[model samples]
Target: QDLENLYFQGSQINQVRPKLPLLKILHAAGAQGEMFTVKEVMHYLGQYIMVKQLYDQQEQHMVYCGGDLLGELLGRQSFSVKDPSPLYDMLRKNLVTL
Candidate 1:
């Protein structure tokens, strides 16, 4: 149990900057063309998903795309409400890493 918080702190502290296009949405979480941990980014992404009220109402996986920040991030828009696992797949590649 104690280990969870320890790992959590380290993950948030460990940061990575994302690409330009991503920064547009990350900006929603107060980003300023800078870096953040994957957890932070994903957490922020979760928040982004929530407040945007983005849901397909009917078979979301197939009918959720348009003129919104979420659409811009996925580059096509085939994601879910809480499937950042990589529905936001490869956001790491979108980061400032290899």
Candidate 2:
């Protein structure tokens, strides 16, 4: 279900940058029929705290869709949505140039 929407959005893009940690965790969680809480997801996302730094150093044009992925997860009803404010803000503030 979630995969379908991912492909739908792919139509509008040339590339995709997936957060590997989140992807692995979500795959495992799905296999175990478990849901991830917002904090758990955010904690996992900490590794990307340097996202902006990395991009700035590379000095390359990039398109990011952190919000889209987050929304997709929520839309598919696969995860919890407890206080998503911080996560959204973080993604918006740090994403490369999209």
Residue 33's lDDT in candidate 1? 50
Global lDDT scores for all candidate models: 0.63, 0.39
For each candidate, what TM-score against the reference? 0.58, 0.24
* lDDT of model number 2: 0.39
* Candidate 2 clash pair list: none
| Model 1 score (lDDT) | 0.63
User: Number of the top candidate by TM-score?
Assistant: 1
Q: Give the TM-score of candidate 2.
A: 0.24
| Structure candidate 1, residue pairs in collision | 86-89
Residue-by-residue lDDT tens digits, candidate 1, 1-98: 68888778645466788777677677875656577777777776656655565655565544253557566656656665455454545584677742
RMSD of 2: 16.1
